[PDB]
Amino acid sequence: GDVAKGKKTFVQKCAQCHTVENGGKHKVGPNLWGLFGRKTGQAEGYSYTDANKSKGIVWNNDTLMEYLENPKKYIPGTKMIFAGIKKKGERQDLVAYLKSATS
Ligand code: HEC
């Protein structure tokens, strides 16, 4: 993945619902600061679905790549309404940016 191309994808497809920065708001979905290594459902002050909280995974390159292909198939019942990034390369750029931007 390339970080700069992942930032482009993030602003195009994600940023209307999420922030990445430390101390950032919960815009529509939860703020993503500290994502990598965290269990699901952990951002303070956000109300998640029981589907998200019960998924039983830790967010890392591997589980993000899977989730971002098709969110509703990975977490049935999630309130994140997004069809997914189907191209692997674009997903890899995005996860490279998220890793860079959220710690
Ligand atoms: C608004 C229409 C959203 C878009 C577009 C994207 N996301 Fe999202 N996301 C949204 C909500 C409402 C939620 C909460 C889901 C729930 O069931 O409670 C989320 C959640 C995530 C998560 C999980 C966060 C964690 O468990 O703490 C991630 C990793 C995430 N979203 C990533 C993400 C990215 C990278 C997006 C662009 C490709 C994206 N989201 C778009 C709402 C919305």
Curated annotation (Swiss-Prot):
Keywords from the named record: Acetylation, Electron transport, Heme, Iron, Metal-binding, Mitochondrion, Respiratory chain, Transport
Localization per record: Mitochondrion intermembrane space
Entry keyword annotation includes Transcription regulation: no
Keyword Electron transport: yes
Signal peptide coordinates: none
Major localization listed first in the record, in broad terms: mitochondrion
GO molecular function: electron transfer activity; heme binding; metal ion binding
Modifications after synthesis and translation: Binds 1 heme c group covalently per subunit.
InterPro entries: Cyt_c-like_dom (IPR009056), Cyt_c-like_dom_sf (IPR036909), Cyt_c_1A/1B (IPR002327)
S-S pairs: none
GO cellular component, one term: mitochondrial intermembrane space
N-acetylglycine found at: 1
Family: Belongs to the cytochrome c family.
Function field: Electron carrier protein. The oxidized form of the cytochrome c heme group can accept an electron from the heme group of the cytochrome c1 subunit of cytochrome reductase. Cytochrome c then transfers this electron to the cytochrome oxidase complex, the final protein carrier in the mitochondrial electron-transport chain.
Designated name of the protein: Cytochrome c
Organism: Thunnus alalunga
